[PDB]
Amino acid sequence: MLLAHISDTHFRSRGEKLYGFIDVNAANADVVSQLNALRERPDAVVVSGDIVNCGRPEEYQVARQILGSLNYPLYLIPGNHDDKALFLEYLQPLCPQLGSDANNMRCAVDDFATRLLFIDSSRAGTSKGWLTDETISWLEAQLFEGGDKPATIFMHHPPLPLGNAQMDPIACENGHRLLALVERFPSLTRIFCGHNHSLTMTQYRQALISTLPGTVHQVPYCHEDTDPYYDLSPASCLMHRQVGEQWVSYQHSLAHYAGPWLYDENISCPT
Amino acid sequence: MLLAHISDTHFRSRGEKLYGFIDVNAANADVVSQLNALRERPDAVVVSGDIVNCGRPEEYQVARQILGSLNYPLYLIPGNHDDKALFLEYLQPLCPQLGSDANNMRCAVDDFATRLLFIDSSRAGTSKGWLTDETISWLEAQLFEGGDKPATIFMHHPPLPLGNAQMDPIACENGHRLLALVERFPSLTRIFCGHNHSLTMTQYRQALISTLPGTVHQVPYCHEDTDPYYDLSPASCLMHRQVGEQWVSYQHSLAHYAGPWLYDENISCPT
Amino acid sequence: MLLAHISDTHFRSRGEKLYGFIDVNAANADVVSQLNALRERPDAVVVSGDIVNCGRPEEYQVARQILGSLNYPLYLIPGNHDDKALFLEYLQPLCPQLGSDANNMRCAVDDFATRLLFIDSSRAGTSKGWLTDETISWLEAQLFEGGDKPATIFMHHPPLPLGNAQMDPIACENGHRLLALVERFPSLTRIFCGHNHSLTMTQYRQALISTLPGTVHQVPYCHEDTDPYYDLSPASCLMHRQVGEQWVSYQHSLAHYAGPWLYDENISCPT
Amino acid sequence: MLLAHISDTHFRSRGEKLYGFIDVNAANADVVSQLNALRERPDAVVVSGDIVNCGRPEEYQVARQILGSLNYPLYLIPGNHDDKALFLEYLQPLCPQLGSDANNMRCAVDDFATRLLFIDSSRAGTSKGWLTDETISWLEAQLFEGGDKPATIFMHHPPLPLGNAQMDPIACENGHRLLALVERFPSLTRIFCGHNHSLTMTQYRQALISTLPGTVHQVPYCHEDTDPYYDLSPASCLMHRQVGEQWVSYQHSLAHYAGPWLYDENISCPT
Amino acid sequence: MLLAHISDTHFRSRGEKLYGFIDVNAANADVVSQLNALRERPDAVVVSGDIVNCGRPEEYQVARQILGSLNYPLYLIPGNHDDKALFLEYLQPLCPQLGSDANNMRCAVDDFATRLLFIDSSRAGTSKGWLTDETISWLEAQLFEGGDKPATIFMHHPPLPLGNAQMDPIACENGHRLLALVERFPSLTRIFCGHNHSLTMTQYRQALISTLPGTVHQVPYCHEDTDPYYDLSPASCLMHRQVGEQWVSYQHSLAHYAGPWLYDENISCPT
Amino acid sequence: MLLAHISDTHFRSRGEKLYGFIDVNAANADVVSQLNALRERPDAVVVSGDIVNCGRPEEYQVARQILGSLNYPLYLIPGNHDDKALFLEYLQPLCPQLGSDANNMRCAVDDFATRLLFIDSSRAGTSKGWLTDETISWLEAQLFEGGDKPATIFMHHPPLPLGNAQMDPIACENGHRLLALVERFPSLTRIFCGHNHSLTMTQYRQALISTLPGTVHQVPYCHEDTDPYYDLSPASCLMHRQVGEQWVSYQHSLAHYAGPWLYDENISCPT
Ligand SMILES: [Zn+2]
Ligand SMILES: [Zn+2]
Ligand SMILES: [Zn+2]
Ligand SMILES: [Zn+2]
Ligand SMILES: [Zn+2]
Ligand SMILES: [Zn+2]
Ligand SMILES: [Zn+2]
Ligand SMILES: [Zn+2]
Ligand SMILES: [Zn+2]
Ligand SMILES: [Zn+2]
Ligand SMILES: [Zn+2]
Ligand SMILES: [Zn+2]
């Protein structure tokens, strides 16, 4: 199992830029070509994101074309910036097991040593995350029927406050409902999130919980500053690889930079 | 508790640059000035690194002056690029609780909600890691006499393989001995490492185990390719904050970039 | 009184770039978000500029949206690149006291310790500036009724030759008419200009007269080279602050760059 | 008269960088080579700066070699970062008319339409400025015996507060004494300063008073915040040219940037 | 004779980017303004290229406008990415002696000491080059009627394999037909090519044969790696100048960079 | 045969930078590490350069260490910036076949399909080139006794004028004497040069004659202007590969840039 995990693409419509000056569409197209030019090729790509920025049809058309151009199976989930109906109309073809019901988009993947669970944490008319009871019970079923085989969950919103002044108020509001499932199921060992536009990580019993940086713009972590900052600090994504009995996630830079060069002992310490 | 955690500074001597072209001294001086310019100030700074590149006294002279100019208490531990004797001679004044015996540099910090444990995994005459009999025992003593209070360990070498073709053969060789301690002690919940020059992370039981990017050069993760690559992709460090009952870690970029701007609802989605 | 003073935006139509390669629209949107993310917030924003590049309706639509997104009262004036009618049709809403007559767009602001005077120096069918007699007499009235209270004037074209080979021929052709008002009114102490895409400054009796750099592209100052150069050297704007009895203007960079860091005496001079 | 006016070079010794990471020596060497490569060549170069950072002899050795390699007559004055004695020992050969007495370095230049006055506002053992009794008197002597010929003064410290939270408490403390001279002498019309590392400008009577950006690092203007910031925003200098009866000053960027291209009417507005 | 020789523009339609992220249209517009802002002005511009990327009408419209804005006579030839019919419909006006027949676009220029020959190496429905028999015989005629006067030929595809793993398979498939003409005609001394997006050069008897870098993206030379790489390494073009009896071609960078500065013997070797 | 051919390294001594601001030592160290990191490894590295800038022993010390760290056999020849005696003392251990006599450094390489000829065109006390009587004779001896086997010559100075206002008066003064050898010997087919810091190329008979860019700074080609310019436009080198019967040379960028990505038919032309 090799997974390329990106999120918060925030696509705009043809010939628009985010905020009028950040070319999300180009940046993402770069990321796509970057991903499908990797030497060690992932088995699938996950997008946990706010796939589009405003939830408009023209935005999903760009998203469909650019994400369509990836040369991998995709697993896609909505965010607060998404519109459930339109997400399903445009993207369901790229991720068929999302289903047929916009209000219950979720699915399980049983192809690898660790089962993958994809869920919708987004709620209409708010930025905050909400886990619906049908989501929770589907989860309970999945985790029970799965037994010992470990599980990871992908969702847009972080299930608990992370001390981020800007991001916490708009976290998953009833995140306790998932936290409780980690108490029930020792098998559930990873939860991965978007929304924070940051690599922030934590542990709750067996579960490693982490948010991801965005593919384009990032938001910094402030503890007592309320200001809605965002910046163009380096974009990054997460690779997930099954390494024997371990799930290992490593950051893979999406920035363009110098190198690589080879390490050489003489060049390292001249005499 | 706010911790600024950098690693793998790899200082060279006054004249010199890493490999002849990477100006580590400048980059670290920048990192230092960056750190002590933060609005939200950490309580201390951790450096888990190969503090110097060649284990030379003139490198420690530079490291002492530059790390010395941080306006924070420091916790410093060595790596395989360090020299036990010289590390102690030059850096012990900047971290007195390391002790007096260069072969058993260690200390516990008890000031915050989570106990901090600093150890030396470096072994003279090899790049690979080793936990000395006395270290393992001191580690187990800390957890045994510590009770419910959670513990995090800082060590240079990762205590398990991570699937990194380059970095795995030179991990901590008796790492399973520390993994044994996490199985036995439910209160050991973070292990943080240098060595890998990358953010790779995994959970074993309750423990979140993660390596850090370097302050300067990075090494990419390859599964198949053993070519000893390094590159100049973006440097970051890890901030550790206590958030009620959670230890949360977030990546703080040390690159220079555009931003920040403020998020504006109307600019985000114009009509 | 804090004023953010930018000019020569040179907006193009939706999905055009200036000269086909300079993205003025993105650059300006950046500037806007930059301005309305300032920590010390100005009382208003002045645009002395060639607001659009070709004087086309589609250009004013972009200008209206982007300048509209600023979170400040705006004071806007035309330039040679503008079209008076269309300027008034699209932008008058953002700056109501321009008036109702495209041929006599001007206004006074009596909110601060120094009265502000906004005038139209642009003339149809030419690049050169022209001050119409009705402009001059309105000015005389304003300056007389104002008495001792100091005044500053904002206009597109510099009232006198500045020794700039390219820019002088297309300066304000009858700039003597304003120069004469500075001789009459000791109260008139600042004149600020666009057009030159440069920070070039001078003094005439009590009056400090200066042109501003552009928000995007700049034109260098040459004394005997006729060539119509322009470059992408760093963009900048002017802040005007009333400091007791002084009007102080300082340059505020619009470039993205490294820092800031804090000055430290030990880091400054090590021992 | 063409003057190239740079300031605040802040040289460090041969090995070293400002604060450990800003390569002032390189940046100034670049600035120097840049200056003596200009197509339109200045008649002389003014340096109003803190020529060196720590007031050390080995810094003056560097400053001497680098400023020495300018192919222009130089006028150099000290700042609070300079050492009177050493400034004279090392730099007086590059500016002979400074004199022989390190406590009264001063000179008038009478070659152009405007008299040039160079003075030393620096005071041993403080960052703030001071005009010595003999300076003030020599200043008044120059203007008194000078008649109608206009005068400009070059000094390190600004002679009045400018609203800069950082830079104001360390302005020229008896600056009002020079302001007294501008009230009495209508021919004193420019005062130019270093210290602030910024282009801020104001008029007092006939005098245009302006500070300059540094050749390397800059300090931003804050009204409220006293945090001693500096940054690496774009460096520029000021060119001073006599244009008939006007002294005009224009900002010359020292950054490296794209351009120039030529303006083409058809490319500007395609059909 | 001064010739500015660019190729492989790869224009996209209005508001598209190559691969969704490389702004070929802006990059080329930059190149155009760059070319027609040269101090030493060429006599004509040659484009050997894949002028457009997909062969679509909307693409030729952008190409027509941007190349139209050059202030020089153009000599234009098709590539594999072009569509012969549409190329002739849109671009023939900018290069009238291409002719009237899309299937036989070629021409000779007898204005300079060396005669220039422009030919179509592109073949419909393939990437590979093909020289048609009518092309070859037109060439034979031209070379015979020309006698001693030297000749250079411009074509899209390189007439022989260059050892480039990616590019060789899609070279000019019957390139032997031209190689044979160089054996027959000692007068034929330069052959210049696009297609390879690289400066790769070779000699066959009297003939110097070279490919050109692209104006935007480049493809690296690999000898046994099949992967279809491309990169954004620096773009460049070729200048051809008749220097007495010699045809000299020099690379002229299209990248933006620092300098120039003037060489100075003292600055070079200080004492 | 794969050759990596760099030129004009211009090393300075340990402390120092070229002209005070260009860090040639770092740039060359980078180039070196870059070279010995190539996937397709050259059989040897040619350096035709002014290996050092001032002809100083401490510069050769640096050059020795840095060129010494290449993991390839080296062929080194001097330029006008070199010192014959010191070049031999310091670099002959890295290229033993240069000989023992500093006034007649030369050698033939016979290992590949094409004979390689390395010579010294540098002349003590001038920047211009000279072929010593014994050189010309040794050259003619090699070609005479060599038969059909093709030959390439590496020399610092270009053997004919190229129309470069700056570089022509300082070409190889008796260059016509080598041109005489190409007329007489049809097997002399490549001549490669440094000196010009540019890729300019021409053919004389069967010989392709080309100069190389420098590893660091470049000098632009002007026909009319003699101002001694240099700039920091992109550095590259030349790879020489034997491809059956063809010697092919391709430019390898040494800059750091975005890419590579893979070409995808569908991404190239979306529907
Ligand atoms: Zn979100
Ligand atoms: Zn988001
Ligand atoms: Zn290590
Ligand atoms: Zn390390
Ligand atoms: Zn204008
Ligand atoms: Zn303008
Ligand atoms: Zn100062
Ligand atoms: Zn200063
Ligand atoms: Zn092609
Ligand atoms: Zn092409
Ligand atoms: Zn040379
Ligand atoms: Zn050279």
From Swiss-Prot, chains A, B, C, D, E, F:
Source species of the chain: Klebsiella aerogenes (Enterobacter aerogenes)
Keywords attached to this entry: Glycerol metabolism, Hydrolase, Iron, Metal-binding
Regulation: The active site contains a binuclear metal center, with a fully occupied alpha-metal ion site, and partially occupied beta-metal ion site. The presence of substrate promotes the formation of a catalytically competent binuclear center by significantly enhancing the binding affinity of one of the metal ions in the active site.
A GO BP entry: glycerol metabolic process
Binding-site list for Fe cation 1: D8, H10, D50, H197
Entry protein name: Glycerophosphodiester phosphodiesterase GpdQ
CC cofactor note: Binds 2 Fe(2+) ions per subunit. Active in the presence of various divalent cations such as Fe(2+), Zn(2+), Cd(2+), Co(2+) and Mn(2+). Fe(2+) is probably the native metal ion.
Organism phylogeny: Bacteria, Pseudomonadati, Pseudomonadota, Gammaproteobacteria, Enterobacterales
Stored PANTHER family: CYCLIC NUCLEOTIDE PHOSPHODIESTERASE CBUA0032-RELATED (PTHR42988:SF2), PHOSPHOHYDROLASE (PTHR42988)
UniProt EC number: 3.1.4.46
Gene label: gpdQ
